[PDB]
């Protein structure tokens, strides 16, 4: 809780910053804004290419795995020995997950999960360690490939958000700290204000690549940032989202041969809902609301079981060796349960044009292939698309019901494993499954009425279950709208997402918020809780405040920084009349360069130590230098944001969240410092 440090998003408009901006504007054309667009274009291209790499590698590797499994099953079907096929399937699942779990559990635990909670925290302004490191990106991409190829009930769309953010946070700096390679470009953007803006473009680019929803990506980053409206930043964020989904579409079209067919804007492509079958009446609106109630209830059950499982894993399965074993066991069980359902499945159908990628004939007539095998052998994206677009009567309720019940618990069990994997697609698949079952039941109860199309209800179920689990409403609705390419479907999708969140919020919080809370991250919500409007800044502020004089003794500065009882990173500058705000990182740079009253530092010198500032212990100061004085006038933030003692908490919370502040100085009516507000002071209210 106390080990998480906030971003320095609010740029300190000190004297050095003013000279640099003045110098830039006088250096002929100002190319800062142009470079922002170039970086955003590169962020979108690279994020799209990463999605291309994941899609191509997974398709080839999973194709090889399923061909091997199908061939082994075919050989042993009539001659006997199918138990070896089960062992081969389980071993192949374990082998891929073993590599995927080891690299996450032993090399970079921060790559576990989808990474969306980590990115949500980063755009919230709080830094989780190692989120945007190069090693994290490599393991996240490699881990998600091994997780999907490993047969886990997971999705690869979710991790794209984390992958895009890491690319954004590294490309924009024009250097690689991990590789110790510094390209002499983009040094201007080596600051927290620019980095968070680029990460929002990267996260938006990841959403657009994952779902083919460039506008949904923008609204995701806008929701998580929750900042003041920045027209030029939002335009650049949309620029990255548009390029990301286009790069994925263009490169995949080349890989698939048909360069003229841009039919793959995202990793998952819902298809076309522009049909008479895909039309709804006003009488179906109460039915859709009821589906959102089911999605909220099932999502709450999904989140409640995962919370209990996560508590168990934190208590008992925290060792890396046990984490690897747990992921391997889940992979073997996932194959085993799938094999058992396929083995005992007595329903098979003739092969359609593309219904089954690897049609498995097992114990039923020639020319027919096991229907339950298609549910497990097909990629979850294909299963979701088929559930969306299939003629009525395509699914036997028993085999679809058994798959839904099993996949629900498998996805819940698999989430929280020490592997890189997403939960978006599994939640979509679960909802599309019981949503289709709801449509089948309605068709049975209405005599196969044309309005009771199971495919349409699969879309509503998928939205209801996804909303019931992750509690995303505005970005999710637009993502669904863009994926279906049908504006009119927004109205039912919005309604089901509203009731799914409302019903789900009654029982438990969302999956992403649940895991952020379990990590004790100081996460700021959109507004202060309703039960805290009676509070003022005086009740929430921290007092007394450790301040520094405008002309402060070096020994005093060192003693304040060297104190081990606390690790404050911001210090108001007083004369206790407030004059400004100085950061710990700024003080370290000043001490390192020995800037004492007794050539001149530039803003680049402070960016040279960014983002890994040396600790105070690395600073060696002599007794003679301890008596020297340091003038903070040219380096402090001369106009820190302040609130009166009597300012209400919602006013304090709104200003802090919107501006992305790290330190908010509380003053009395005489401009005397009386308290300090940081994110931990605001996040403690629930």
């Amino acid at each position: 809780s106390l080990k998480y440090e906030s971003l320095d998003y609010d740029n300190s408009e000190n004297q050095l910053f003013l000279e640099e901006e003045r110098r830039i504007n006088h250096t002929a054309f100002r190319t800062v804004e142009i470079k922002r667009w170039v970086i955003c274009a590169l962020i979108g291209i690279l994020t799209g290419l990463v999605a291309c790499f994941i899609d191509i590698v997974v398709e080839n590797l999973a194709g090889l795995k399923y061909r091997v499994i199908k061939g082994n099953i075919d050989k042993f079907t009539e001659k006997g020995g199918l138990s070896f096929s089960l062992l081969l399937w389980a071993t192949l699942n374990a082998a891929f997950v073993l590599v995927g779990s080891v690299i996450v559990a032993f090399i970079e635990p921060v790559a576990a999960g989808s990474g969306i909670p980590q990115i949500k925290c980063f755009l919230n302004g709080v830094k989780i360690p190692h989120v945007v490191r190069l090693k994290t990106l490599v393991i996240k991409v490699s881990g998600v490939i091994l997780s999907v190829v490993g047969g886990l009930a997971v999705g690869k769309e979710g991790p794209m958000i984390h992958s895009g953010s890491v690319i954004a946070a590294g490309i924009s700096q024009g250097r690689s700290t991990s590789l110790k390679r510094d390209f002499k470009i983009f040094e201007y953007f080596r600051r927290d204000t620019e980095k968070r803006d680029f990460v929002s473009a990267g996260a938006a680019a990841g959403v657009s690549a994952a779902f083919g929803a460039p506008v949904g990506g923008v609204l995701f980053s806008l929701e998580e940032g929750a900042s003041f409206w920045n027209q030029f930043l939002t335009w650049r964020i949309f620029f990255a989202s548009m390029i990301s989904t286009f790069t994925l579409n263009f490169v995949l079209s080349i890989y698939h041969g048909n360069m003229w067919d841009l039919s793959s804007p995202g990793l998952i492509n819902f298809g076309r809902f522009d049909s008479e079958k895909m039309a709804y009446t006003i009488h179906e609106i109460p039915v859709f609301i009821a589906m959102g109630v089911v999605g909220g209830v099932l999502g709450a059950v999904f989140n409640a079981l995962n919370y209990w499982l996560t508590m168990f894993r934190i208590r008992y399965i925290h060792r890396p060796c046990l984490q690897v074993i747990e992921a391997v066991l889940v992979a073997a069980v996932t194959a085993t349960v799938a094999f058992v359902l396929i083995y005992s499945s007595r329903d098979c159908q003739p092969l359609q044009g593309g219904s089954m990628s690897y049609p498995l004939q097992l114990f039923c007539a020639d020319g027919e292939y096991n229907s339950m095998a298609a549910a497990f052998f097909n990629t979850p994206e294909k299963s979701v698309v088929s559930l969306f677009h299939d003629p009525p009567g395509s699914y036997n309720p028993l085999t679809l019901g058994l798959f839904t019940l099993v996949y629900f618990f498998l996805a819940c069990w698999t989430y929280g494993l020490t592997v890189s994997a997403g939960v978006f697609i599994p939640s979509l698949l679960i909802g599309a499954a019981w949503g289709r079952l709801f449509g089948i039941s309605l068709s049975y109860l209405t005599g196969a009425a044309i309005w009771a199309d199971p495919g349409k209800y699969a879309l509503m179920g998928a939205a209801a279950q996804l909303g019931g689990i992750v509690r995303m409403t505005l970005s999710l609705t637009v993502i669904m709208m863009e994926a279906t390419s049908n504006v009119t479907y927004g109205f039912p999708i919005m309604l089901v997402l509203m009731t799914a969140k409302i019903v789900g919020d009654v029982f438990i919080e969302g999956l992403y918020d649940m895991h952020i809370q379990l990590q004790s991250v100081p996460f700021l919500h959109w507004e202060a809780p309703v039960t805290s409007h009676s509070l003022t800044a005086r009740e929430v502020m921290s007092t007394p405040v450790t301040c520094l004089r405008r002309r402060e003794k070096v020994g005093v500065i060192v003693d304040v920084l060297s104190d081990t009882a606390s690790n404050h990173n911001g210090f108001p500058v007083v004369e206790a009349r407030l004059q400004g705000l100085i950061l710990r990182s700024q003080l370290i740079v000043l001490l390192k360069h020995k800037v004492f009253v007794e050539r001149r530092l530039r803003l680049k010198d402070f960016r040279d130590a960014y983002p890994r500032f040396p600790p105070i212990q690395s600073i060696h100061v002599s007794q003679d230098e301890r008596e020297c004085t340091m003038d903070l006038s040219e380096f402090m933030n001369p106009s820190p944001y302040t609130v009166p003692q009597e300012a209400s908490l919602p006013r304090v919370f709104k200003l802090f969240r919107a501006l992305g502040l790290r330190h908010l100085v509380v003053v009395d009516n005489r401009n005397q410092v009386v308290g300090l507000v940081t994110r931990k002071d605001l996040a403690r209210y629930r």
Partner: protein
């Protein structure tokens, strides 16, 4: 009205399309489309191409309801959907050897069924005739992917596909001759053991932290 020397390609196309429609119906329930009237389809195509080669303007796009064009489109659509091009060779002049090879094996398998009809004898007498017919049907399903660069393996010559289905419905739905070996007990034992592993892993981890 058109000239008499122009209303003869139209008249030739009439009975030629009439005879193609005649065969398409009487060769439908037992599908022999690509073998019975592959000439009668080419007769329509050639006689239509003769119009394209002073009657094209006055007979093809001279009115809203282009009967000659849509009828040729219907035959082409029926030909392509039936995949009769695969059912012949490249020059499209006679049945390919593989189709003839499958057809006589189809005849041989059906001949085997009659011999052993008078279902116990059928399953255990010419079973290998069914497997070689089924194995061949999978063989042509595979080279069809590589010969014409098709993405999936979906549909061969409709006569071949119908013939294979006729055998499959007889071999599986009328008579119960198929017997895949179900290792139920070995599958249960292996599956139960694997599903019991997470129970041991979680319980042992719980019982190890307890008592430290």
């Amino acid at each position: 009205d058109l000239d008499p020397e122009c209303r003869e390609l139209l008249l030739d196309f009439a009975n030629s399309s009439a005879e193609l429609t005649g065969c398409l119906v009487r060769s439908a329930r037992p599908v022999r489309l690509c073998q019975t009237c592959y000439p009668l389809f080419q007769q329509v195509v050639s006689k239509m191409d003769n119009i394209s080669r002073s009657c094209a303007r006055s007979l093809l796009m001279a009115d809203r309801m282009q009967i000659v064009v849509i009828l040729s489109e219907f035959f082409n659509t029926t030909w392509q959907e039936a995949n009769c091009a695969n059912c012949l060779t490249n020059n499209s002049e006679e049945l390919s050897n593989s189709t003839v090879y499958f057809l006589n094996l189809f005849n041989h398998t059906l001949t085997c069924f009659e011999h052993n009809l008078q279902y116990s004898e059928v399953c255990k007498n010419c079973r290998e005739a069914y497997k070689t017919l089924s194995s061949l049907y999978s063989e042509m399903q595979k080279m069809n992917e590589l010969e014409n660069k098709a993405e999936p393996g979906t549909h061969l010559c409709i006569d071949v596909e119908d013939a294979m289905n006729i055998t499959r419905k007889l071999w599986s739905r009328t008579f119960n001759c198929s017997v895949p070996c179900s290792d139920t007990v070995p599958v249960i034992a292996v599956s139960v053991f694997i599903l019991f592993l997470p129970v041991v892993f979680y319980l042992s981890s719980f019982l190890h932290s307890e008592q430290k």
